[PDB]
Amino acid sequence: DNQFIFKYSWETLPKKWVKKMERSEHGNRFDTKTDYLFQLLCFLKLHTYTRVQVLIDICGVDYPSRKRRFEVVYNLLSTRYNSRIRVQTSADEVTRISSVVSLFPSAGWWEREVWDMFGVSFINHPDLRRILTDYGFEGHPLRKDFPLSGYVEVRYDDPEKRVVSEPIEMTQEFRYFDFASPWEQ
Amino acid sequence: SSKKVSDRIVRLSAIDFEGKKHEVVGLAGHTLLKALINTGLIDPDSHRLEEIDACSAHCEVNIAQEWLDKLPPRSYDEEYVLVRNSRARVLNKHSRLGCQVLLDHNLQGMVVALPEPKPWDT
Amino acid sequence: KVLPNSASVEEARQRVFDFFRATCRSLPSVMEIYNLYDVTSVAQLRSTVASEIRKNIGVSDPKVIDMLLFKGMEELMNVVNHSKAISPFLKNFYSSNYF
C-alpha cells in the first residue's frame, strides 16, 4: 500500500527516463535506463515530497535468455512518507553502470557484492574489490551458468604444508530432481 | 640589434630531491642560484647574498660530468665550503655552489640536481 | 579507483599501457612475496606478461578491453596479497576415454 509518492513521482518526475512503471501490491516498480539511474535516484533522494533518503539494498538477477542478462534492482525506502520504492535497470557483462555511492554511502558494499556475484562493474565506485568469495576467486558465483558446486575446492597438502586449491572431484554428485509438473502452466 | 631579453634567457632543467623534473629559466650573467630561487625550488630567505662568504652550501647543486666541462672549475674557497658544509666531510666531485655558476648560452640546456634541503633559520 | 568505459581504441591502449606499467613496477614486490629467485628470471616474467597481453589482441571491443584490464588489476592485487613421440592423440587414448 501507500502508493502516494509513487504516483506523485510519476506526476513530477521527468518522463525522459521512465522506461516503464508497474503498480503492484508486491511493490511499486520503476524500470529505467542505466544512463539516467543516478539522476533519477538523485531526484528521488533530494525532492521534498519523495524523500527516499535510505537505500534498503541493491540486488542482481540473472536472465540468460535476454540480451542484457543482468538486472540491477534498487530497493529504497521513504521513512518520512513511509513507503518503499523499486528502481531497476538492465546491464550486461561488459558495460559499466553508474554508481550511487555518492548519494547513498551504504551502496558501496552492496555494489561490491553485485560485482562479486554477477560481474556488473560500476563507474564511480571508490573501490570495487571482491567482498564475499575467496581471495583469487575466478568466476561470478550467482550467474545461472555458474555451477552450484563451483570449479575448485581446497584441501591440505602435507608436502606443501599449506592449504592448496584443486579442481573439484567431489563424491556424491548433486542429484537434481525434476519435480516440475506438465500441468502447472 | 633590438636588444631584447630572449637572447639573454638561458633555459636549463633541474631535478629536485624527490625526483620531480623542473624547468628553470635564468638570464645570462645571473647565477644558477638566482635562477633556481626565481623558479621557486630554493628558499629565497635561506640564501640572500650571492657571495662565497655568505654561502653555507645551501646553493649546492649536483651537475653531470659532461656539463662540468663547460664551466670554470671549482675554486679553493668553493671546495672548502663544500667539504665543511656536508653530511660527511668529503667532496662529491659532481657538486658545485650555485653562487659561482655563472649562467650562459654555453651552459644553456644544462641539467642539475637539487639535493635534500638543509635548515638555515638560527 | 574505477574509471568509465573507454570510448576510443587510443584510450583503451593508454589504459593497457598504464596497467602494464603497474605490473612492471609491482614485479619486484612479488619477488619477496614468493621467493623463487632460483628460476624466476624477472625478465622472463616480464616477457610472459607481455606475451599474455599480446595473446589478448584478438579482442577489439573497448568494453571487453576495460573489463580485462579490471580483472588483470584485480589479479595483480591478489598476487601482491599472496594468493596463489607417440602423438598427442595416443597419449590421451592410453590415459582415458574422455579427451
Next chain:
Amino acid sequence: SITPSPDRVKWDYRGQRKIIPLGQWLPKVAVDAYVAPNVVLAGQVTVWDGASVWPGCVLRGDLNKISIGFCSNVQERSVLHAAWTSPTGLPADTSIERYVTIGAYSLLRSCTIEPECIIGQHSILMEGSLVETQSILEAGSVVPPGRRIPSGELWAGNPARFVRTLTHEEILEIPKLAVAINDLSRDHYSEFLPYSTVYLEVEKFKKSLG
C-alpha cells in the same frame, strides 16, 4: 538594462584610503620612506627605506608584488602595476632596485629596474622589460614587452633605441640625483604629523547632524 544601486556612496566623507590591503596582503611602507597622502598603494606593495613616492601616483600590486628599493624615487602621477607571468618567462613582479629615479608619468608594469637608474617622464615600461644597472632612459621613451635596456647606456624614442654610451662622470650622478630627490622628500615629510586632525572634523559633522 542597467540597475542603479540606491545605496551607492556618492560621497565617502574620506578620500581614497592610502593603503588598501587585499586579503592577507598588507602594503608595507618603511617609516623612513615618504609616501604622499594622495597615493594609493593596493595589495602587495613594499616600499623600503628612503623611498620617495610622490603625490598623485598609484601602485597596484594586487596581481603580483611591487617593490620600491632604498632611496628610490617614484614621481607624481605615475602608475605601477604587475601581472601573472611575463612574455620573457622571467618573474613578472615589478621590482625597482635602489637609487632609481622614475619620472612623473611613468607607466611601469612587470619591470625589473636594476639599481642606479634614471627614467624620464612619459616613460612606459611594459611587461618583462628590465633596465640594467647604471642606465638612463629619457622622457617619452616606451619599451616594448620583453625589451631590455643594456647597462651603461642612454636610450630614447617612442620605440626604445640606443642613443649613446654613458661616461663615468655621467654615471656617477645617478645616485646623486636619487639622494637629491630623497632630500626633497625628507623636506616634504616634515609637514605631516603622525595622526591627522580630520577626526575632529568628522566629530563636528556628527554633532551637527546629531
Next chain:
Amino acid sequence: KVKASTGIVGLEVVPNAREVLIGLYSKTLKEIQKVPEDEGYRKAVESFTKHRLSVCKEEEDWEAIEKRLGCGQVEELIEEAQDELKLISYMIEWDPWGVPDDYECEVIENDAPVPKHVPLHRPPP
C-alpha cells in the same frame, strides 16, 4: 518559547527558523523560475513552496507554523528546503526536460490481491 530539543540527534534547533524558511522559500521560487513552465516538477515546486511561504508568513510562532502545516519540525522543513535548492541546481546543471520524441513508456497495472497479514505500509491518517 524555545525548543529544548528536536529529538533528532543530527538536527539542531535553530532560533530564526521562520526567517531561514522565508529566505529559503524565496530563493526556491527565484531558482525554479528558471525551469520550463510545461514541466510538472516546476508546477509542483511552485505549488508547495508558495503554500509553505504563505503559511510561514501568516503565522509567526514556529509552533503555530508547524501545527498549521502539519509536517512539523521546522528543522526538517529547512533541511527539505536546502535539499530542494540542491535538486533545482542539479536539474539546471543537467537538462532532463522534454520528451525525447518517438517515446514509449510501458505502464503496468496488476490487481493481484495480497493477504491482510503481509507487511504493507499503511497510509498515514
Next chain:
Amino acid sequence: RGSFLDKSEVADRVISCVKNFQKVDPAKVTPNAHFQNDLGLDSLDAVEIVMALEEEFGFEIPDNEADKINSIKHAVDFIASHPQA
C-alpha cells in the same frame, strides 16, 4: 663522492639491456637508433624496454620522460642526467 653514473657505463648498461630482447638483434642496434623503426619493435616493446631500463637502474621513470625515451641516445642521456640512477 660521486652523484651521477658515468656516461660510458650508462651507455654500456643500456646497450646490454637492449641486447637482452628476443626480437631485437645485436647487428641493428646502435647508440642512435629509433626503437620503432631501426629496431623494428612495437609500442609494447618500447614500454617493456623502458621498464627494463628503469628496473636495471633502480629508479622510477616519470610517465612523460618515459614516453620521450624512444631512442637509445635519449635513454642514455636521461639515465646519465638523473641523480637517482
